Design a protein around this ligand. Structure first.
Ligand SMILES: [Cl-]
Ligand SMILES: [Cl-]
Lengths: 470, 471
């Protein structure tokens, strides 16, 4: 009914690095592929457990349904700034991935956040720094040059142009070739390596990008074995008013029925400049209708939402308790999309979209049957048999402890009735990612610590329907 | 050397309406056309002097260099909400115009603010209400229906579409036909008038637009005698983060030299949602390179501006003293654009663009020679014999009093050397608009009160180089 845990990504112990020199792993994502492979994704947090520092986006693959696992594959690992005073905040940062496979092209996507060097999200500029300029139709990333106000641009082949549109002999590595693409952003003047556009302190080159918040995507066409260079999808989805835009980590979906069948959905959330992380964190999805080539932002659950007898909008809100942050997305058989959102009510909050994740119904449903201690969760659609269910996993509480697997029935109505609640991991429990394995089996990859382990070790268990019904 | 004043728009006295039932006139704009005609524009503020209520955008024409003036022509006058409880805030509002003529096509433009019914800018929603939606390449105005969350849209022919994209039996008057276009926004079902999409209280129809801030444009091809229906240019220029976006009233310009020759420049200013009117008012220009067909926003003077050793951006700033609001724009012979900005320093603030108004130099120049009491100003380029000058008019102070005309030599590098400072109106003096008349003689339309006149009566005077040069 329930396997012992197998550690997939092992953290160090007692504040020290593990044998691989890594203190921490965080942020599990779990994906069952068309070939039957399991892909387990994580942040490899080398220096410490926080959402900054030197972090690699990594996966391991299992070809035997989770029994054994191959070598870590590093998707992306931006190089640290060797001149940074504080190495703990001294590297351009990637954190938080969402995995999903396109069932038609078989292409697998990892979408994750990026910040230039600094304390991650806390390293964003206090005043807006424009990150992109649209020139004669084409969108280019901006560079700021030491002691100058104007917006330089990174154009084709990575040639840097002056604010007034003249090509310089500066070049940015826009087609990285090094393992894990560690050369991305390197800045050259002709033949000479000068620095990196993602460095923001003690710079040895003239140029840096905006101190803002970015969304990157890498893809695999060989079942997770190798990965493309990162693709900067930010300007496709990030509105000018948005401060932070980041993923709700875990595993995204592809709509399997209705008019929008084939659409890829990725949970994300934003903040605004009015109240940032204090009162504006707002869930939504981004989506692709062309197999991951182009991306669009849906509306926020909080857009024109009625809260306490007054309307709010994700761009202007300042309401701590009306926030909804990281989320997990499921499509029902009736075509409706459900968004389960981390928040501050103490119980489960759920939004419904009838147009394939573009807009949301006027009310958020709350379920007091499922506690929410303000931590990430994952949920998946499952059939059994053939009655419709959703499995949702998160911390039971009262703190981030006692991992639970919750079973809901989806009524002919679209409503959910919570039937079963079963512990899956005693002790520390935080982020997690569920997947159907087939033949009545399910897998979960989750954050837990024991025996002095640093936050966190990511471990894998399998369970079956008999476990669910307990 | 200086004519006596001719009142062009006369306010009421002692808080009462004038003979035409109008309490107030405000916001002068003066335009010398290609034909020599003088167009004088204003807000005709019927009920009171404030930036809301029942206001018409009006002009008068002078064909003899300001001696006689014709009848008032009303460009736009949205109808009031007949069911509003408080008539003082009971009408959709237009305020604040900028005039300009395209020297090539001879088209004359009037660009002005619009708000739905309410207390003008103070009637904007406290949270963002989306005003436009893009669907299959086309941008549509949104309508909101009582008790429903979703965005209805006004599509082709004014037909209202449901949020899920189906045609309804409702239609909006998108091509208004009544005098001063007072039927604009009327909401019909079949042939029955139900109400108006600009009404926000005590509505008789199901739909209203976003409670936001809009920019409208009307044009004339017959020297100001008649005007087009208003064109909503907002979606071309208003970024998602912007709260207010409104004109810096007066007279805009067309660049006459350099790589951007022919560009129409219209001063505007924005606020953001972080500090709105308290800490974010920020000047910029909108512009057209295709004779007014399409419009674009330049960057703010405040965008990536260093202020006390720290950067600000117009979209995020909260700095009262760093604001710049209504402004007046001039192009120099060297091609630089100068933006003279209303602000809170006590003296003249000037920004410079080297790229035809799109981006601004890192420094704002302050000129101690010219006082600024926190009020609108105007400035024009002028050639004399033929050396290059700017004339700038505003209140000399200490309050909104003593209208001055300021003369600057423009130096080869674009610096301004202030030469002369002459009073042009004792007592009350506020908004104003200068033009070159020819000789050189010069005209000015300005706000002033005397004899108990309500804020304001707008008057016209001429002056010559001899009054300008006065020691
Ligand atoms: Cl560098
Ligand atoms: Cl109505």
């Amino acid at each position: 009914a329930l396997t012992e845990k197998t550690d997939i990504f092992e953290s160090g112990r007692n504040g020290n690095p593990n044998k691989d020199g890594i203190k921490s792993y965080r942020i599990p994502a779990l994906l069952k592929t068309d070939k039957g492979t399991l892909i387990a994704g994580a942040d490899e947090r080398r220096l410490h457990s926080s959402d900054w520092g030197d972090i690699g986006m990594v996966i391991r693959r299992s070809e035997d349904n989770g029994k054994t696992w191959g070598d870590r594959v590093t998707i992306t690992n931006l190089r640290d700034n060797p001149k940074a005073s504080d190495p703990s905040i001294g590297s351009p940062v990637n954190i938080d991935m969402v995995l999903v496979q396109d069932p038609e092209t078989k292409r697998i996507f990892s979408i994750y956040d990026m910040f230039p060097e600094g304390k991650g999200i806390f390293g964003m500029s206090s005043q807006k720094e424009e990150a992109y300029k649209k020139i004669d139709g084409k969108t280019y990333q901006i560079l700021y040059r030491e002691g100058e106000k104007g917006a330089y641009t990174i154009r084709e082949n990575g040639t840097v142009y002056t604010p007034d549109g003249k090509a310089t002999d500066y070049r940015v590595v826009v087609d990285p070739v090094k393992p894990a693409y560690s050369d991305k952003g390197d800045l050259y003047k002709g033949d000479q390596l000068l620095g990196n556009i993602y460095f923001t302190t003690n710079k040895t080159s003239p140029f840096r990008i905006a101190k803002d918040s970015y969304l990157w995507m890498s893809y695999s066409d060989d079942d997770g074995k190798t990965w493309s260079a990162p693709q900067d999808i930010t300007p496709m989805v990030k509105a000018d008013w948005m401060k932070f835009l980041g993923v709700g980590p875990g595993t995204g979906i592809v709509l399997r029925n209705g008019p929008h069948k084939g659409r890829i959905l990725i949970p994300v959330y934003t903040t605004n400049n009015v109240s940032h992380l204090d009162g504006s964190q707002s869930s939504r999805v981004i989506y692709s209708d062309d197999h991951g080539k182009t991306w669009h932002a849906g509306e926020a659950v909080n857009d024109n939402r009625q809260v306490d007898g007054q309307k709010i909008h994700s761009s202007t809100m300042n309401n701590r308790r009306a926030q909804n942050t990281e989320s997990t997305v499921v499509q029902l058989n009736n075509g409706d999309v459900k968004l389960f959102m981390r928040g501050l009510t103490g119980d489960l909050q759920v939004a419904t979209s009838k147009d394939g994740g573009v807009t949301w119904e006027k009310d958020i449903k709350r379920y007091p049957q499922v506690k929410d201690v303000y931590v990430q969760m994952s949920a998946i659609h499952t059939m059994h048999e053939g009655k419709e269910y959703i499995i949702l996993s998160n911390a039971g509480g009262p703190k981030r402890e006692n991992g639970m697997v919750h079973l809901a029935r989806v009524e002919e109505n679209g409503e959910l009735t919570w039937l079963k609640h079963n512990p899956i991991q005693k002790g520390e429990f935080a982020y997690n990612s569920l997947q159907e394995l087939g033949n009545g089996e399910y897998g979960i990859l989750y954050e837990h610590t024991e025996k002095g382990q640093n936050a966190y070790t990511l471990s894998f268990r399998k369970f079956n329907w008999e476990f669910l019904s307990k």
